[PDB]
Design a protein around this ligand. Structure first.
Ligand SMILES: CCCCCCCCCCCCCCCCCC(=O)OC[C@H](COP(=O)([O-])OCC(O)COP(=O)([O-])OC[C@@H](COC(=O)CCCCCCCCCCCCCCCCC)OC(=O)CCCCCCCCCCCCCCCCC)OC(=O)CCCCCCCCCCCCCCCCC
Ligand SMILES: CCCCCCCCCCCCCCCCCC(=O)OC[C@H](COP(=O)([O-])OCC(O)COP(=O)([O-])OC[C@@H](COC(=O)CCCCCCCCCCCCCCCCC)OC(=O)CCCCCCCCCCCCCCCCC)OC(=O)CCCCCCCCCCCCCCCCC
Ligand SMILES: CCCCCCCCCCCCCCCCCC(=O)OC[C@H](COP(=O)([O-])OCC(O)COP(=O)([O-])OC[C@@H](COC(=O)CCCCCCCCCCCCCCCCC)OC(=O)CCCCCCCCCCCCCCCCC)OC(=O)CCCCCCCCCCCCCCCCC
Ligand SMILES: COC1=C(OC)C(=O)C(C/C=C(\C)CC/C=C(/C)CC/C=C(\C)CC/C=C(\C)CC/C=C(/C)CC/C=C(\C)CC/C=C(/C)CC/C=C(\C)CC/C=C(\C)CCC=C(C)C)=C(C)C1=O
Ligand SMILES: CCCCCCCCCCCCCCCCCC(=O)OC[C@H](COP(=O)(O)OCCN)OC(=O)CCCCCCCCCCCCCCCCC
Ligand SMILES: CCCCCCCCCCCCCCCCCC(=O)OC[C@H](COP(=O)(O)OCCN)OC(=O)CCCCCCCCCCCCCCCCC
Ligand code: HEM
Ligand code: HEM
Ligand code: HEM
Lengths: 422, 48, 55, 446, 106, 52, 53, 32, 55
C-alpha cells in the first residue's frame, strides 16, 4: 500500500466547497451537503422538506425515474437522504469502477429536478406511512413538541409535515424552495474513494446552475412554553431544557462535558450505571423501572441543554425532583476532579469511536465544511476538549439553573409537575 | 465536532430507495429494557 | 325494508343482467338484434319440440 | 486507479498463533487509534439439555456482575472510567464477550476479559435478581412477533433435536436452576482450545500474544472423568405450526427449507439467489413496478408490508427460506408469488439477474466489514466455523465462478420438490394447508 | 420546401377533416381516440379543467347522438382553432413504455 | 413484433427446449398408443405381437 | 363495397356453372380476401396520416 | 413464555427411515 | 402477478364452486352421494345419447 493520504480542500469562485480524500478501499462514497433544512420554511409553506427528501427517486430532465432506480439497483449501490433542521445530506455508495455513472444521477437529482405534478400527487399518501413509523417510537413525538415549545419561529418547525398539509403540498412550492435554497454557495461536496482532480471536472457541469446566495432565515427566538399531551400510555415521558450555548463555541464544550458527567450515555450492557449521578439520585427515589439521562442539542443559532426521564406515571414527580436537585448540587460547586477526567475520557472515546465508521466520518466532514470549510483533525478536538476547567462547568450549571425552562411531556400526566412549580 | 449524529440532540430522519428509514439520537432509551417490561407490539405500520 | 331483489341470489343475477344493467343511452337499433337472436332461438326450440312429437 | 480485485490485495491479513494450552490468537492490524478485543466460545444451546436449557442465557446476565478480583460494581467502574464499551451476545452455537476501547488501553482490557471468563463469581442473591429479570425479559420477547415465529420455526424444523429449543429456555426451567448446575456448565464448557481471542484495529499481534499468555494461559484443557461433550447431527422435519390469534394486526408467516452446513461451497451460490429475490419494506423509495420482481409485484395489489430472505447456517445443517408479513386477506396471494419466484430461479435464470445478484453480494461483503467491531466478529466466527479467515480475494474468486446454469442446478438441488417447514403466528385463517403449500414446490409444466 | 404540394396537402387534410363528422358535434380531434391503457393513463394526468371540458363535450355529443340531431352550423369545430391538448401527455406515456420494453429484453 | 427479440429471450427458449422436446415426445407416443397405429407399432419388439 | 361483394357471391351461388358466372365468382372471391387482408389496414394508416396523429 | 411450547412426539406415525432424531433425513427423502 | 383463476370470469365460478369453497372437515361418506348423483346424471345422458342414435 501507499502512504496515508490527506484530504484536499478547495473553494471554487462560485463559493462551493470541494473536499476529497484518496483511500484505497474498494467501495467509493460521495456526498452532497446542503444548508437547506426545516428551519428555512415559513408559515406559508410547511412540510416541504419532509416531502422533498422523498422525491430523490423522481424523474429529472436529464434522466427518467425508471432509469435512476434500475441503474443504481443493477450496480448494487445505494442513495439516501439524511435530514435535520439545519441541513440536508444526499449520499451515494457504489464500487470504484461505477463512480462516473452514479454521480451523473446524483448531480441530476439536485441540479435539474422536474417535479411532475401527477408524480407528486401519487407520492403524497406515502407521507402518512413515513410519519406513522417515526411516531411509533414515542421519543420522536416528545422532541418535536419540545422544539415547538422552546422556539417561536425558526427551529420550532417540525421535521414531519403537519397532518392538515399532507394533501396540499404542491410542486410550485417544491420548485420555489429549490431555487432559493439549493444555491451553490450553500452546498458542499465530499468524496472518499474518488480522486480530487476528477471531482473538479465532474462538478464543473453544474457551475452553470444555481449560484450566488440563497434566501436567509430568521434567528430562532426563545419562548419557554409547555406542551402537554395526555395520552393513554402508562410510561410517561418528559423533557426539561433550557437555553444553552451555540454550536462550535468554547461554552458548548463545557455543556458536552456536563451531560457526560450526569451519565448521559450507557456503556455496559445489562448493568446499572453506578458512576452516573442521575441513576444514583433516582435509584433511592423509585423502586420501579426508570430511565434517565441528559440532553444536548447545539445549533448554529442556539443550543438547548436539559434532561429526559422515562418513569412510571405515579413516580414522575419524584424522578424529576431528584434529577433537578442533583443539578443544583453540581451548580453549588460540589464537583470532584475524578468525574471531570472520567467524563472527558468518555467524550474522546465516543468521538473517535463514532468517526471510526466511514459513513459517520463522511457525515462529520460534510457538517464541518458547510459552516467553516476547513477540516479540524481529531487531535485538535482533543486539545480543545482538554482545556475545559471546573469553573467553566460550574458556570454552565448555574446558567442552566437560572435560565427559563421549556417542558414537553407525553403520558398519563396524572402526577407530572408543571413549569413554575418544578 | 459539528455533526449531531454523534450527539444526543435532535433526531435524523433518513430515507433510501433500497434501505429503510430509521431515526437516531442518543437521549435515554434501550436501557429501560433491563429494569422494565416495555413491550414492542406490532401495529398498523410494519417495517423491519 | 330494503328491496328484495338485492338479497335473493336468483334475483341478484336478474337484477345485474336485466334491471340495473348500466347501458349507454345512444345505442341505435343495431344493438337490438342481440336480444332478437336469443328470442328467435327460444322460438325455434319450442317450435321444434312440438314437431319432434310427430317426426 | 485501483481495480476491484486490485484493491482487494491491499487489505491486511490476519496473523494466527497458538498458545501451549491450545488457545487461538488472531489479529488484524491497522492505523486506527481504537480496537475491539473479544473472546468467542463454541458453546450454545445446542450443547444443553432440558435440565440446563437456559444456562447460557443466565450466565450472560451474570457475566459482568462481579468477579473474585473485582467484586460487585468494581468491574463496571473500571470499564466506564476507561470510556470503553463492554458488550456480549449469545446464540444456539456461539457466545462472545468483546470490548471496544482505545489502543492505549489494550493491556487492561485483556486482563479484565480473562478475569471475566475464569473467575465469574456466582453469588446467590444475584441469582435471585436475575431470575425475575429474565422472567420480565421473556415477557417482552413475547411482544416481539418476529422472535416468536423464528423460535417456532426452529421448534418444528428440528423436532426432538437439541437445536429445536430456544436460547433462553422454558420459564419453568429458569426458576429452578442453582449455583451447582451453572458451575458444572461453566467448568465443562468454557475452556481452551474452544476459546478464540480476536483483536482488530490498531493492535500489534506481538503485543496481543504476550498479554494472552500472561492471563489466558492458565485455562485448563483437560476434562474431568473424560466427560467430553460430543456433538451430534441434527435431523430436519417437514412440518407446520399454527398459532392463531385474530386480535393481532397482521399475519406473520415464516417458511424455510433445509440447507447446507456453513462449510459447503454451495451456500455461496444460494446467497446469490437470495439477492435476486431481495427484500422489501413499506418505507423504501420508489420500486413500484420499478424494483426486483418479487418487490415489483409486492406493490401492484399492495400485498406485503415487508418480506426478507434469510439463510441460517449451522454445522452440518441450516435453514434457507423467506420471511414475510401480510394483511389478513392477502396471505395466500403473497405465498403464491413467492413460490413462483423460487421455481422460476430453479428453471429460468438469466445472467442479467445473476450479475445483479453478484454485484449486490460484493457490496454487502465489503460494506458490512466497515468498522472494527464487524471485523473482529468475522475473525472470531470464522476461526470457530472454518478454522481460518477466508480473505476477500478468495470470496471474489468463488463468486466469479457463479453462472446462471450453476444457480439453476443448486437451486434445483435444495428448493425443488422439497418438503418445507412453516410457521405462522397471527390471523392466519387464509394460510393454505400444508398439502397446497407442498404442491406449490414443483411445476406441472416443467 | 414544396409550396403547391404543401398547400394541396393542407387543402386535402382540411377536406378530410370536414368529411369527418365529429366537428359537427363540437368534439375535438383528441376526444375520438380509442381509449387503451396508454390513453387511460394519459387522461389521468390531465389538469382538472381540461378533464372537465372533455367530459362535458363527450356528454353533449352522446346526448345529440341520442336524438339524431346536429349542432348548429355556427357552433361546429373549426379546422384551425383545434388544440391537440392530449398529444404531449400521450407521447410521454408511449415513450416510457418503449424504454421499459427496451430494458426488459436485456 | 420486435420486443420479443433480445439476448435473454433467446436464453429462455434454450432453457425450455428440453421440456418442449419431452412434451412433444409424450404427445406423439400418446397419439400412437391411443390410435393403435400399426404402421409405427409394427416395429416395436413386444407390442407388435398384439397384431394376430 | 365488401358487403356488395358478399351479395355478388350469394347471387352467383344461385346460378349454374357457366363462363360469366365462374369468372365473376373468382373475381369476387379474390376481391373479398384482398379487401380484408390488404386494403383495410392500408387505408386505416392513410387516414391516420391525414389526421396528423 | 412462548419458549415453553414444544411439538409433541409423533414417533407412532413417523416412517422407519426418519424414526431416529440423529440420522439426517436427506439420505432417504429421495427414496421415500 | 396474481393467479389467473381469481381474475378470469369463467375461472372465478370454477374456483368458487369447486376449488376453494370452504367445507367442513368432518363430513362423512354420506356427504359423498351428492357428487355421485350428478356423475350418474352425466353417465345417463351420454349412454342414452348413443342409444338415441339407433332407437
Ligand atoms: C339502426 C339501423 C339498423 C336497422 C335495424 C332494423 C332495420 C329495420 C328498419 O328499417 O328500422 C330500423 C332503422 C333505424 O335506424 P336508426 O337506429 O334510427 O339510426 C341509426 C342508423 O343505423 C344510421 O342512422 P344515421 O342517421 O346515423 O345515418 C344516416 C341514415 C339515416 O337513416 C334513416 O334516416 C332511415 C330511418 C328513418 C326513420 C325510421 C322510422 C320512421 C319511418 O341515412 C340513410 O339511411 C340513407 C341511406 C341511403 C338511402 C337511399 C334511398 C332509400 C330510399 O331503420 C333504418 O335505418 C332504415 C334502413 C334501410 C335504409 C332506409 C333509407 C331511407 C328510406
Ligand atoms: C402437453 C403439455 C402442455 C404443457 C403446457 C404448460 C402451460 C403452463 C402455463 O402456462 O400455465 C401453468 C398451468 C396453468 O395454466 P393457465 O391456467 O392457462 O395459466 C396460464 C399462465 O401460465 C398463467 O399461469 P398462472 O398465473 O395461472 O399460475 C400458474 C399455475 C399456478 O398453480 C396454481 O396456483 C393452481 C393450483 C391448483 C391446481 C389444480 C386446479 C384444480 C384441478 O396456475 C394454474 O395451475 C391454474 C390451474 C387452473 C386449471 C383450471 C381449473 C381446474 C379445472 O398450471 C401448471 O402448473 C401446469 C399444468 C400443466 C398440466 C399438463 C397436463 C398434461 C396432461
Ligand atoms: C384420430 C383419427 C384416427 C382415424 C384412423 C384410425 C384407424 C387407422 C386407419 O384407419 O388406417 C389408417 C392408418 C393405418 O392404421 P392401421 O392400424 O393399420 O388401420 C387400423 C384400422 O382402423 C382397422 O379398421 P377395421 O375395419 O379392420 O376395424 C374397425 C376399425 C375402423 O374404425 C375406425 O377407424 C373409426 C375411425 C374414427 C376416428 C374419428 C374419431 C374422432 C372424430 O375400428 C376399430 O377397431 C377401432 C380403431 C379406430 C380408432 C378408434 C380410436 C380413436 C380415438 O392409421 C393411421 O394412420 C392413424 C392416424 C392417426 C395419426 C393422424 C394422421 C393424420 C396425418
Ligand atoms: C361434494 O362436493 C361437491 C360439491 O359441493 C362442494 C359440488 O358442488 C359438485 C358439483 C356438482 C356436480 C357434478 C353435480 C351435478 C351438477 C352440475 C353443475 C353439472 C350439471 C350437468 C350438466 C348440464 C350436464 C353436462 C353434460 C353431459 C353428459 C354431456 C352432454 C353434452 C355434450 C357436449 C357432451 C358431448 C357429446 C359428444 C361429443 C358426442 C360424442 C360424439 C363424438 C366424436 C362424435 C361427434 C360428431 C359430431 C358433432 C359431428 C358434427 C358434424 C357436422 C356439422 C358435419 C360437418 C361437415 C363438414 C364437411 C364441415 C361436486 C361434483 C362435488 O363433489
Ligand atoms: C379424478 C380427479 C382428482 C384426481 C386428479 C386431479 C388431481 O389430483 O389434482 C391435483 C393435480 C396436481 O396438482 P397439485 O399438485 O395439487 O397443485 C398444482 C401443482 N403445483 O392436478 C391435476 O389435475 C393433475 C392431472 C392433470 C395434469
Ligand atoms: C397395493 C398398494 C399397497 C400400499 C401399502 C403398502 C404397505 C404399507 C405402506 C406404508 O405403510 O407406508 C409407509 C411407507 C412404505 O413403507 P416402507 O417404510 O418404505 O417399508 C416398509 C417395509 N416393511 O414408508 C416409506 O418409507 C415410504 C415413503 C413414502
Ligand atoms: C348465435 C347466437 C348469438 C346470441 C344469442 C348472441 C347474443 C348476444 C347479445 C344478446 C348481445 C347483446 C347485444 C348488445 O348489447 O349490443 C351480444 C353482443 C355481442 N355479440 Fe353476440 N350473440 C350471438 C352470436 C354472435 C356472433 C356470431 C358474434 C360474432 C362476432 C357475436 C359477437 C358479439 C359481440 C362482439 C357483442 C358485443 C357488442 C357490443 O359490445 O357492442 N355474437 N350477443
Ligand atoms: C337454432 C336452433 C335450430 C335451428 C337453426 C333449426 C333449423 C332447422 C331447419 C332449417 C330445419 C328444416 C326446415 C325445413 O326443411 O323446412 C329443421 C328441421 C327440424 N328441426 Fe330444427 N332447428 C333448430 C332447433 C331445433 C330443436 C331444438 C329441435 C327439437 C326437437 C328441432 C327439431 C327439428 C325437427 C323435428 C325438424 C324436422 C322438420 C320437418 O319435419 O319438417 N330443431 N330445423
Ligand atoms: C337421469 C337421466 C335418465 C334416466 C334416469 C333414464 C332412464 C331410463 C330408463 C329407466 C330406461 C328404460 C330402459 C330399459 O328398461 O331397458 C331408459 C330408456 C331409454 N332412454 Fe334413458 N334415462 C335418462 C336419460 C336419457 C337421455 C339423456 C337420453 C337421450 C338423450 C335417453 C334415451 C333413452 C333411450 C333411447 C332409451 C331406450 C333404451 C331401451 O329401450 O332399452 N335417456 N331411460
Amino acid at each position: 500500500p501507499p502512504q496515508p493520504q490527506d484530504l484536499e480542500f478547495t473553494k471554487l469562485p462560485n463559493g462551493l466547497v470541494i473536499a476529497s480524500l484518496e483511500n484505497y478501499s474498494p467501495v467509493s462514497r460521495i456526498g452532497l451537503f446542503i444548508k437547506a433544512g426545516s428551519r428555512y420554511e415559513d408559515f406559508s409553506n410547511l412540510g416541504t422538506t419532509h416531502l422533498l427528501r422523498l422525491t430523490s427517486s423522481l424523474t429529472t430532465k436529464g434522466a427518467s425515474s425508471f432509469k435512476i432506480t434500475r441503474g443504481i439497483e443493477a450496480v448494487g449501490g445505494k442513495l439516501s437522504v439524511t435530514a435535520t433542521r439545519e441541513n440536508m445530506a444526499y449520499t451515494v455508495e457504489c464500487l470504484r469502477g461505477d463512480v462516473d455513472i452514479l454521480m451523473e444521477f446524483l448531480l441530476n437529482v439536485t441540479t435539474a429536478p422536474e417535479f411532475r405534478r401527477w408524480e407528486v400527487a401519487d407520492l403524497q399518501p406515502q407521507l402518512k406511512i413515513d410519519k406513522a413509523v417515526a411516531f411509533q417510537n414515542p421519543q420522536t413525538h416528545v422532541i418535536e413538541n419540545l422544539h415547538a415549545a422552546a422556539y417561536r419561529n425558526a427551529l420550532a418547525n417540525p421535521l414531519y409535515c403537519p397532518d392538515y398539509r399532507i394533501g396540499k403540498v404542491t410542486s410550485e412550492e417544491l420548485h420555489y424552495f429549490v431555487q432559493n435554497h439549493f444555491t451553490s454557495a450553500r452546498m458542499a461536496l465530499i468524496g472518499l474513494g474518488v480522486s480530487h482532480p476528477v471531482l473538479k471536472q465532474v462538478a464543473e457541469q453544474f457551475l452553470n446552475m444555481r449560484g450566488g446566495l440563497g434566501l436567509s432565515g430568521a434567528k430562532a427566538n426563545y419562548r419557554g412554553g409547555e406542551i402537554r399531551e395526555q395520552n393513554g400510555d402508562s410510561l410517561v415521558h418528559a423533557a426539561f431544557v433550557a437555553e444553552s450555548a451555540v454550536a462550535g463555541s468554547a461554552e458548548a464544550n463545557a455543556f458536552s462535558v456536563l451531560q457526560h458527567v450526569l451519565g448521559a450515555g450507557p456503556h455496559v450492557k445489562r448493568g446499572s450505571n453506578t458512576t452516573s449521578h442521575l441513576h444514583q439520585a433516582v435509584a433511592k427515589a423509585t423502586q420501579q423501572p426508570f430511565d434517565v439521562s441528559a440532553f444536548n442539542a447545539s445549533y448554529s443559532d442556539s443550543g438547548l441543554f436539559g434532561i429526559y426521564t422515562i418513569s412510571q406515571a405515579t413516580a414522575a414527580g419524584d424522578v424529576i425532583k431528584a434529577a433537578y436537585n442533583q443539578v443544583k448540587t453540581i451548580a453549588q460547586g460540589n464537583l470532584s476532579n475524578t468525574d471531570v477526567q472520567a467524563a472527558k475520557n468518555k467524550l474522546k472515546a465516543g468521538y473517535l469511536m463514532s468517526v471510526e465508521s466511514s459513513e459517520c466520518f463522511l457525515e462529520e466532514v460534510g457538517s464541518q465544511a458547510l459552516v467553516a470549510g476547513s477540516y479540524m483533525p481529531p487531535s485538535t478536538v482533543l486539545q480543545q476538549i482538554d482545556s475545559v476547567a471546573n469553573a467553566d462547568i460550574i458556570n454552565a450549571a448555574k446558567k442552566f439553573v437560572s435560565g427559563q425552562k421549556s417542558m414537553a411531556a407525553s403520558g398519563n400526566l396524572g402526577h407530572t409537575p408543571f413549569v413554575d412549580e418544578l | 465536532m459539528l455533526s449531531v449524529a454523534s450527539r444526543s440532540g435532535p433526531f435524523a430522519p433518513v430515507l433510501s430507495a433500497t434501505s429503510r428509514g430509521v431515526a437516531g439520537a442518543l437521549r435515554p432509551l434501550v436501557q429501560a429494557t433491563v429494569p422494565a417490561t416495555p413491550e414492542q407490539p406490532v401495529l398498523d405500520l410494519k417495517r423491519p | 325494508m330494503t328491496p328484495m331483489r338485492k338479497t335473493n341470489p336468483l334475483m341478484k343475477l336478474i337484477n345485474h343482467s336485466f334491471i340495473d344493467l348500466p347501458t349507454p343511452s345512444n345505442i341505435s337499433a343495431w344493438w337490438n338484434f342481440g336480444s332478437l337472436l336469443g328470442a328467435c332461438l327460444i322460438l325455434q326450440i319450442t317450435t321444434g319440440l312440438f314437431l319432434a312429437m310427430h317426426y | 486507479t485501483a481495480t476491484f480485485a486490485q484493491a482487494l490485495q491491499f487489505v491486511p491479513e490476519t496473523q494466527v498463533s497458538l498458545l501451549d494450552n491450545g488457545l487461538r490468537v488472531a489479529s488484524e492490524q491497522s492505523s486506527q487509534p481504537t480496537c475491539t478485543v473479544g473472546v468467542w466460545i463454541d458453546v450454545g444451546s445446542r450443547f444443553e439439555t432440558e435440565k440446563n436449557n437456559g444456562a447460557g442465557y443466565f450466565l450472560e446476565h451474570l457475566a459482568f456482575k462481579g468477579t473474585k478480583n473485582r467484586p460487585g460494581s468494581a468491574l463496571e467502574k473500571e470499564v466506564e472510567s476507561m470510556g470503553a464499551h463492554l458488550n456480549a451476545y449469545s446464540t444456539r452455537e456461539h457466545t462472545a464477550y468483546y470490548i471496544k476501547a482505545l489502543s492505549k488501553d489494550l493491556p487492561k482490557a485483556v486482563e479484565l476479559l480473562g478475569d471475566i471468563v475464569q473467575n465469574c463469581s456466582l453469588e446467590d442473591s444475584q441469582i435471585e435478581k436475575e431470575r425475575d429479570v429474565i422472567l420480565r425479559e421473556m415477557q417482552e420477547n413475547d411482544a416481539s412477533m418476529r422472535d416468536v415465529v423464528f423460535n417456532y420455526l426452529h421448534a418444528t424444523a428440528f423436532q426432538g433435536t437439541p437445536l429445536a429449543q430456544a436460547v433462553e429456555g422454558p420459564s419453568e426451567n429458569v426458576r429452578k436452576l442453582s449455583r451447582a448446575d451453572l458451575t458444572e456448565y461453566l467448568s465443562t464448557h468454557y475452556k481452551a482450545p474452544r476459546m478464540v481471542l480476536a483483536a482488530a484495529g490498531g493492535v500489534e499481534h506481538q503485543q496481543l500474544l504476550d498479554l494472552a499468555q500472561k492471563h489466558l494461559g492458565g485455562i485448563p484443557w483437560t476434562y474431568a472423568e473424560d466427560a467430553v461433550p460430543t456433538l451430534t447431527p441434527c435431523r430436519f422435519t417437514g412440518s407446520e405450526i399454527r398459532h392463531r390469534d385474530d386480535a393481532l394486526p397482521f399475519a406473520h408467516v415464516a417458511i424455510a427449507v433445509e440447507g447446507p452446513g456453513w462449510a459447503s461451497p454451495d451456500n455461496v451460490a444460494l446467497q446469490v439467489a437470495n439477492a435476486i429475490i431481495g427484500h422489501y419494506d413499506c418505507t423504501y423509495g420508489g420500486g413500484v413496478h420499478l424494483s426486483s420482481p418479487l418487490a415489483s409485484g409486492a406493490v401492484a395489489n399492495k400485498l406485503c408490508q415487508s418480506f426478507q430472505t434469510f439463510s441460517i447456517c449451522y454445522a452440518e445443517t441450516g435453514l434457507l427460506g423467506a420471511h414475510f408479513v401480510c394483511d389478513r386477506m392477502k396471505i395466500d396471494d403473497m405465498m403464491f408469488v413467492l413460490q413462483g419466484q423460487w421455481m422460476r430461479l430453479c428453471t429460468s435464470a438469466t445472467e442479467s439477474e445473476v450479475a445483479r445478484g453478484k454485484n449486490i453480494l460484493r457490496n454487502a461483503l465489503v460494506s458490512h466489514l466497515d468498522g472494527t467491531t464487524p471485523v473482529c466478529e468475522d475473525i472470531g466466527r470464522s476461526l470457530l466455523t472454518y478454522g481460518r479467515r477466508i480473505p476477500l480475494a478468495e470470496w471474489e474468486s468463488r463468486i466469479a465462478e457463479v453462472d446462471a446454469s450453476v444457480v439453476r442446478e443448486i437451486c434445483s438441488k435444495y428448493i425443488y420438490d422439497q418438503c418445507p417447514a412453516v410457521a405462522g403466528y397471527g390471523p392466519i385463517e387464509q394460510l393454505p394447508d400444508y398439502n397446497r403449500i407442498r404442491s406449490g414446490m414443483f411445476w406441472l409444466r416443467f | 420546401a414544396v409550396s403547391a404540394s404543401g398547400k394541396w396537402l393542407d387543402g386535402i387534410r382540411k377536406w378530410y377533416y370536414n368529411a369527418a363528422g365529429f366537428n359537427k358535434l363540437g368534439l375535438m380531434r383528441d376526444d375520438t381516440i380509442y381509449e387503451d391503457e396508454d390513453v387511460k393513463e394519459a387522461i389521468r394526468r390531465l389538469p382538472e379543467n381540461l378533464y372537465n371540458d372533455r367530459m362535458f363535450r363527450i356528454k353533449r355529443a352522446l346526448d345529440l347522438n341520442l336524438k339524431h340531431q346536429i349542432l348548429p352550423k355556427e357552433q361546429w369545430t373549426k379546422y384551425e382553432e383545434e388544440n391537440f391538448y392530449l398529444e404531449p401527455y400521450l407521447k410521454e406515456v408511449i415513450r416510457e413504455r418503449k424504454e421499459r420494453e427496451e430494458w426488459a429484453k436485456k | 413484433v420486435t420486443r420479443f427479440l433480445g439476448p435473454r429471450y433467446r436464453e429462455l427458449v434454450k432453457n425450455w427446449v428440453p421440456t418442449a422436446y419431452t412434451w412433444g415426445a409424450v404427445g406423439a407416443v400418446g397419439l400412437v398408443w391411443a390410435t393403435d397405429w400399426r404402421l409405427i407399432l409394427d416395429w416395436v419388439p413386444y407390442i407388435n405381437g398384439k397384431f394376430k | 363495397l365488401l358487403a356488395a361483394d358478399l351479395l355478388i357471391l350469394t347471387w352467383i351461388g344461385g346460378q349454374p356453372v357457366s363462363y360469366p358466372f365462374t369468372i365473376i365468382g373468382q373475381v369476387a372471391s379474390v376481391l373479398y380476401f384482398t379487401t380484408i387482408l390488404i386494403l383495410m389496414p392500408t387505408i386505416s394508416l392513410i387516414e391516420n396520416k391525414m389526421l396528423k396523429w | 413464555s412462548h419458549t415453553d411450547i414444544k411439538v409433541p412426539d409423533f414417533s407412532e406415525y413417523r416412517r422407519l427411515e426418519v424414526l431416529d432424531s440423529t440420522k439426517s433425513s436427506r439420505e432417504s427423502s429421495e427414496a421415500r
